Amino acid sequence: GSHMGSFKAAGTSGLILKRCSEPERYCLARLMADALRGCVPAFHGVVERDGESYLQLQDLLDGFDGPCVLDCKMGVRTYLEEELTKARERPKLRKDMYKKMLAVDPEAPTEEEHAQRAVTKPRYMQWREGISSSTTLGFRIEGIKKADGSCSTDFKTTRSREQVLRVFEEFVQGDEEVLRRYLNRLQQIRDTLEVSEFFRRHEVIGSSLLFVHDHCHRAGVWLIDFGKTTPLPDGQILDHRRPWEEGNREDGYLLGLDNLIGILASLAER
Numbered sequence: 001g002s003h004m005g006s007f008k009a010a011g012t013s014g015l016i017l018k019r020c021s022e023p024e025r026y027c028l029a030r031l032m033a034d035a036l037r038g039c040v041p042a043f044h045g046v047v048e049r050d051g052e053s054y055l056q057l058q059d060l061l062d063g064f065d066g067p068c069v070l071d072c073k074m075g076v077r078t079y080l081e082e083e084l085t086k087a088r089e090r091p092k093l094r095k096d097m098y099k100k101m102l103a104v105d106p107e108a109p110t111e112e113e114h115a116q117r118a119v120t121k122p123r124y125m126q127w128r129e130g131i132s133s134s135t136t137l138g139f140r141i142e143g144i145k146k147a148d149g150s151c152s153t154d155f156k157t158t159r160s161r162e163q164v165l166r167v168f169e170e171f172v173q174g175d176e177e178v179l180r181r182y183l184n185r186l187q188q189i190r191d192t193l194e195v196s197e198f199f200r201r202h203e204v205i206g207s208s209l210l211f212v213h214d215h216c217h218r219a220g221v222w223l224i225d226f227g228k229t230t231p232l233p234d235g236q237i238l239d240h241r242r243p244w245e246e247g248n249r250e251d252g253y254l255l256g257l258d259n260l261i262g263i264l265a266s267l268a269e270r
């Protein structure tokens with residue numbers, strides 16, 4: 001298997017290039033020497049391709065024969081707290097996000113948003129959290145790429161525990177071995193997160209769990225996308241379960257993982 005926005009084919013077999021960003025490069029470097037080393041794609045350093053910097057990553061699809069892929073965005077919160085400060089002091093009115101909001105729900109915007117034809121990023125991202133499962137379950141399905149070539153990103157209103165279960169039910173297509181392997185992996189990831197020095201000291205926002213399986217029953221799960229993962233002020237740590245309140249920088253990451261494990265455990269007994 002192979003993946004090939006921000007991605008480019010690598011020179012070397014089994015690798016992929018992702019546009020380098022400073023938060024993400026800092027994170028992947030730290031993760032290679034963390035408990036979470038095996039839970040993330042291998043990071044091999046940075047390369048230049050036509051004057052641009054790329055992260056050299058493990059292509060997670062490379063082991064698989066016609067991979068099925070599900071991207072699950074983790075956390076009750078999907079934006080940095082500084083976005084709220086910027087939206088109050090010096091707001092950037094996003095005409096595009098008003099349109100994207102209008103497209104999903106023409107009646108979601110306020111009187112004033114309608115008049116602006118524009119919303120703030122945090123307002124848009126909080127709305128996306130509330131009509132998806134992000135706010136109540138601490139994760140949401142972002143998309144699926146199936147082995148039949150078909151892909152879907154039509155999950156913005158996938159919200160209830162039972163709606164999420166039905167997406168995973170269709171994704172695994174009755175393969176008990178794949179589901180057992182996903183649950184074993186998620187249990188071991190949760191154990192690793194609970195002991196990780198990196199995880200206790202970082203606010204993990206905008207990251208995904210990438211589920212990958214094939215018709216040969218190979219199955220894996222990795223954490224990806226550390227573009228918005230930021231170190232806490234030294235000596236401060238998060239519990240990753242307690243509710244977010246502006247200033248505490250809580251992400252609900254483990255509330256999301258606990259709920260996700262519960263849903264797959266439910267599916268396995270159906």
Ligand SMILES: Nc1ncnc2c1ncn2[C@@H]1O[C@H](COP(=O)(O)OP(=O)(O)OP(=O)(O)O)[C@@H](O)[C@H]1O
Pocket residue numbers: 003005006016041057058059060061069071206208210224225226227
């Ligand atoms: N290391 C990897 N190997 C294989 N596929 C990958 C890898 N990393 C990412 N992908 C694929 O690329 C998709 C997007 O990756 P990622 O979320 O890291 O990018 P992004 O541009 O930061 O996206 P966004 O910030 O909008 O969530 C994943 O859902 C997955 O299909």
Ligand SMILES: O=P(O)(O)O[C@@H]1[C@@H](O)[C@H](CO)[C@@H](OP(=O)(O)O)[C@H](OP(=O)(O)O)[C@H]1O
Pocket residue numbers: 078079100121128206227228
């Ligand atoms: O998925 P959407 O289109 O509803 O919403 C997009 C969301 O998925 C992206 C991932 O979080 C988010 O980027 P980040 O700043 O969070 O990395 C992107 O913001 P910008 O348009 O400002 O680039 C949103 O529009």
Ligand SMILES: [Mn+2]
Pocket residue numbers: 206207208224225
């Ligand atoms: Mn992402």
